[PDB]
Structures are given as structure tokens and as C-alpha cells.
Amino acid sequence: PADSFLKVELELNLKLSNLVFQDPVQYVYNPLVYAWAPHENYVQTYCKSKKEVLFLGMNPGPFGMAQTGVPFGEVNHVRDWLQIEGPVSKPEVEHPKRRIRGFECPQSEVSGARFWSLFKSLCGQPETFFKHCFVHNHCPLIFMNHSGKNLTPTDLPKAQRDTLLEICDEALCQAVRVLGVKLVIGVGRFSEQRARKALMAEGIDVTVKGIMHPSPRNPQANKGWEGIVRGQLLELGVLSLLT
Amino acid sequence: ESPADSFLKVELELNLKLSNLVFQDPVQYVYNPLVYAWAPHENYVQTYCKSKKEVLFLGMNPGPFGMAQTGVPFGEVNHVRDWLQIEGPVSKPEVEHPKRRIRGFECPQSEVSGARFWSLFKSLCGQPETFFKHCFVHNHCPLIFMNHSGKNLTPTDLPKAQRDTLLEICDEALCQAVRVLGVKLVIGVGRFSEQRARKALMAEGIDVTVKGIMHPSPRNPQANKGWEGIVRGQLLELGVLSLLT
DNA sequence: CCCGTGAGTCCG
DNA sequence: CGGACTACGGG
Ligand SMILES: O=c1ccn([C@H]2C[C@H](O)[C@@H](CO)O2)c(=O)[nH]1
Numbered sequence: 412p413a414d415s416f417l418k419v420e421l422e423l424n425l426k427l428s429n430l431v432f433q434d435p436v437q438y439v440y441n442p443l444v445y446a447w448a449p450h451e452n453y454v455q456t457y458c459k460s461k462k463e464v465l466f467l468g469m470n471p472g473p474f475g476m477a478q479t480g481v482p483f484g485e486v487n488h489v490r491d492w493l494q495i496e497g498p499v500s501k502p503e504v505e506h507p508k509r510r511i512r513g514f515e516c517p518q519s520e521v522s523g524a525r526f527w528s529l530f531k532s533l534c535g536q537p538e539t540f541f542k543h544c545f546v547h548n549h550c551p552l553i554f555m556n557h558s559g560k561n562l563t564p565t566d567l568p569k570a571q572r573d574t575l576l577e578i579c580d581e582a583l584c585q586a587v588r589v590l591g592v593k594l595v596i597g598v599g600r601f602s603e604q605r606a607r608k609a610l611m612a613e614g615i616d617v618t619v620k621g622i623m624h625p626s627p628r629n630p631q632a633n634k635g636w637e638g639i640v641r642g643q644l645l646e647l648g649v650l651s652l653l654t
Numbered sequence: 655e656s657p658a659d660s661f662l663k664v665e666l667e668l669n670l671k672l673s674n675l676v677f678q679d680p681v682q683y684v685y686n687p688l689v690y691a692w693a694p695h696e697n698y699v700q701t702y703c704k705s706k707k708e709v710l711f712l713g714m715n716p717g718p719f720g721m722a723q724t725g726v727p728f729g730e731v732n733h734v735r736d737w738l739q740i741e742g743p744v745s746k747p748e749v750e751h752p753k754r755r756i757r758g759f760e761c762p763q764s765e766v767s768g769a770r771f772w773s774l775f776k777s778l779c780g781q782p783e784t785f786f787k788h789c790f791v792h793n794h795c796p797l798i799f800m801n802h803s804g805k806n807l808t809p810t811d812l813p814k815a816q817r818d819t820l821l822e823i824c825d826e827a828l829c830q831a832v833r834v835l836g837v838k839l840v841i842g843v844g845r846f847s848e849q850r851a852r853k854a855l856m857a858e859g860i861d862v863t864v865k866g867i868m869h870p871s872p873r874n875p876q877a878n879k880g881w882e883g884i885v886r887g888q889l890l891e892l893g894v895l896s897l898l899t
Numbered sequence: 900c901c902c903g904t905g906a907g908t909c910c911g
Numbered sequence: 912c913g914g915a916c917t918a919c920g921g922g
């Protein structure tokens with residue numbers, strides 16, 4: 412599935428490279444272009460067989476995946492526990508306050524540190540997490556307004572969001588079919604809900620569940636995110652598979 | 655001789671003057687199927703405007719599921735494809751609202767106005783050659799407008815400033831189209847086109863009759879109870895049934 | 900982020 | 912002379 416999975420991402424990059432954003436959207440980065448190499452290293456190293464479980468995020472945050480090309484790709488955990496590195500280039504148009512520095516980005520993505528710290532504690536080594544699991548985002552683009560502020564797919568005006576999310580809904584169907592996934596875990600309500608509508612519409616044979624999003628913008632994530640999600644994972648019965 | 659070429663250059667020149675307008679405010683999207691649906695359009699004019707005409711039917715502007723998809727006036731997909739037998743590649747506008755995508759001849763929707771319009775002529779004439787022997791069909795304005803959520807805006811829903819130069823420019827191209835075609839009689843489909851055409855042709859002193867038929871729009875309840883029956887009677891009264899065997 | 904409250908569009 | 916569906920601010 413590594414090669415097939417990367418083909419789906421390349422075909423999705425092609426359809427997205429034709430969209431045009433505006434309005435409050437002023438910058439659009441695709442790390443699956445300028446951080447293709449560590450992305451493709453992550454997929455070749457960790458996507459070696461079919462998967463039972465897909466964790467699905469919404470999109471890149473500015474300091475993790477936007478820098479490293481790896482879902483929830485906070486720099487220290489990507490460098491040190493996943494052991495993925497690779498050259499990173501730059502978007503053609505950078506916001507000054509959001510330049511791409513790759514594996515030299517000084518900021519920690521809180522969402523990504525939390526997410527990989529959890530699976531690091533639970534699984535020990537990355538091979539144990541990836542025996543049956545994989546992690547991916549619904550949307551590979553990141554968007555800023557004039558002042559460098561992040562607009563998630565949800566903050567896009569409706570006219571710009573429906574366009575984009577229908578194209579990613581279709582790439583998501585293709586991803587789930589190539590990986591053989593039986594269980595999609597939406598990270599946050601938006602991915603959970605989006606994946607469920609999209610997959611049910613194609614009648615793919617797959618169950619869609621959810622865990623809480625780690626984001627620090629989520630006030631409930633700021634006490635005990637790890638403890639709440641260890642309890643959600645136990646309920647979905649995936650701890651089993653993570654040992 | 656044959657007006658096809660000249661009709662196209664009229665529309666090509668109107669396309670030019672229009673490409674220069676900036677729209678505002680409530681208007682967020684503007685399409686022009688004469689650019690991205692040029693090929694079926696040009697195929698319809700060449701196939702059916704080979705000779706000079708007695709009557710021009712005139713509509714206001716493309717609807718989102720008829721002419722906006724097929725480039726043919728009142729251009730509901732099934733009738734254009736199966737009755738007029740007009741095909742061509744259709745590409746997309748520069749900027750599309752997600753509720754108003756252009757799918758060309760793959761558009762699954764059947765525009766009610768357009769399906770009504772051509773189904774009348776199909777029943778009345780049999781074959782398209784009979785209807786086009788002396789008639790043709792065109793719109794006053796080739797553009798389509800949408801607000802921020804994809805809702806259609808008619809040319810008259812436009813802020814007066816934009817509305818007036820747009821119509822004035824269309825009026826001018828309409829007077830040429832009428833000259834190029836040779837028509838004795840313009841029938842506006844719906845009130846706006848009838849009135850606008852009367853005001854455009856009288857104001858440049860063209861010696862042409864302007865009449866009217868009810869518009870087939872399902873927004874009008876009288877059209878939903880028996881449009882075809884009303885318009886057959888209106889066409890009788892105008893003496894045009896003889897032209898359409 | 901997650902949810903609640905509620906306004907634009909369709910009902911051809 | 913409503914029903915369903917699907918922006919934005921505060922927790
Ligand atoms: O008893 C009544 C009658 C009417 N209406 C409102 C709703 C309806 O749309 C309109 C009259 O039919 O006024 C009510 O709320 N209650």
C-alpha cells in the first residue's frame with residue numbers, strides 16, 4: 412500500500428493545485444510539495460502492509476506537519492521517536508511570520524507533541540504503533556490570512572470549503588480502500604464527522620469512530636487529554652492492537 | 655446570404671465589451687458560457703443560422719442548468735443533445751461556486767424553463783430544421799451572476815450603475831443581431847426581454863415589431879399549470895404558427 | 900477545538 | 912396566512 416497510498420496523495424495534490432483561494436485566504440502551503448521527501452520517508456517506513464486502523468486528522472498545523480511533512484508532525488517527536496528527517500524546501504509564497512524552516516523550526520506543535528507522546532508511552536517503539544495503524548490527514552493544505560493567522564478548513568468561507576472538502580473526501584475513500592482499513596478514528600469531531608459521511612456515501616466497508624482533538628485551542632484538551640484519550644481508545648478496543 | 659459568421663462576431667464583439675466590466679457587492683461570481691461553452695455554441699449557430707430569419711425569440715440571460723452548461727439558449731441538456739443534436743466540449747469558468755459547477759453535457763439536472771421551451775417547439779415542428787427555417791433564439795445578456803452563496807442574480811437584481819452599462823451594451827449588440835439576422839419580428843420570452851427589446855430597437859430607430867410570450871419559468875404559477883397551452887394560443891394570435899408548419 | 904444558537908435558501 | 916438543512920462568538 413505504500414506506493415498506492417502515495418499515488419493517491421499525488422493525485423490529490425494535482426486536483427488541489429488547480430483550486431483558487433481568496434478573500435481572507437492569502438497564503439496556502441502544501442507540505443506534500445515542499446516537504447515531499449520526509450513525507451515519503453514516513454510513508455515508506457511506516458506503511459509497509461495493509462492497516463486495520465487509520466487515525467485521521469483535519470489538516471497541518473503551522474509548526475508540525477507544515478514543517479516536517481508528517482501528520483501531527485511535531486519536530487522533536489518526528490526526529491527522535493519516528494526517526495524521519497529529509498530535506499525540506501519552501502512554499503513559493505511565504506507569509507513573513509510563517510516561514511518554513513523544516514526540521515529547524517524552533518516552535519513545538521502542541522497538538523503533535525501530545526499525539527505522538529501518547530503513542531510513544533503506549534507503544535514503546537514506532538513499529539509497534541505502526542504494526543496495524545497509520546495516521547493521515549483529511550486535508551494536506553494549510554491556510555493563512557493577511558496577518559499569518561491559521562484558518563482551518565472550518566474557518567474557510569463555505570464557497571471555498573465545499574470545493575476543497577469534496578476533493579479530499581474522494582481521496583479519503585481511495586486511501587481507505589488501498590490501506591484495507593477497517594477502522595477510521597477521526598481526531599476531533601470535524602474529521603470524525605467528515606470521514607463518516609464520506610465513507611458511508613461510497614458504502615465502503617469500514618467503521619468510523621472518534622477521539623478528542625489534542626489542540627490547545629480545545630479547552631477540554633488542556634486537562635488530561637492523554638487520560639481522556641487513553642479511555643476512549645480502551646472503549647474502541649484499540650489498546651489491544653497497540654501492545 | 656448566411657448570417658452565422660456575423661452573428662458570432664456580434665457575440666464575440668459583445669464578449670469583448672463585457673470582459674471590461676467590474677461587478678460588485680452582491681455579485682460574487684460571473685460566468686460567461688460564450689467563453690467556456692463556445693464550441694457547442696458555435697456548433698448551434700452554424701447548424702441553425704445558415705439563412706436569414708423572420709422571427710427572433712429572445713430571453714434575458716442563461717439559466718444555471720441550461721445555457722450555462724450547454725452554451726445553447728434555453729439550453730436544457732436533454733433537448734439540446736437529443737433534439738437539436740448539438741454536442742461540443744465544455745470547459746469550466748475561472749472561478750466556480752461549488753453549488754454551481756459546470757458539468758456541460760454531463761449536467762444531471764433538467765432545466766425546467768429550457769425543457770419547456772424546446773419541448774413546445776419539438777411538438778409543434780417535429781424536427782429542428784422546421785423550427786429554424788424562419789426562427790432563431792438568442793439572449794439579451796450572455797452572462798450569469800451569482801451572489802456569495804451561489805444564488806442566481808438576474809441582470810435586473812444588479813446595483814444600478816453596473817445594471818445600466820451592462821444593459822446598454824447588450825441593447826447595442828441586440829440591435830446588430832437583429833440587423834444581421836434580418837428579422838421582421840422579435841418575441842421577448844417573459845416581460846423583461848419584451849420590454850427591453852422594444853426600448854432597445856425603438857431607440858435606434860429600427861423598423862421591427864416586438865411582441866411577447868409568457869416565460870416558462872417554474873417560479874411563475876401560471877406557467878406551472880399550462881405554459882404550453884398558454885404559449886400555443888399566444889403564438890396563434892401573433893400569426894407565427896404558419897411559419898412553424 | 901467543540902458546541903449552541905440561529906439566519907439564508909429551497910421547497911421546479 | 913412552516914420544515915429541513917446547514918456563521919460565529921464564548922467556554
Ligand atoms: O393559529 C395559528 C395560525 C397561524 N399561525 C402562523 C403560522 C402560519 O404560517 C400563518 C398563518 O397560516 O401564521 C400561527 O402561528 N398560529
Ligand SMILES: O=c1cc[nH]c(=O)[nH]1
Pocket residue numbers: 467468469470471472475476481482483484522523548598
Ligand atoms: O497534522 C495535524 C496537526 C494538527 N491537527 C490535525 O488535525 N492534524
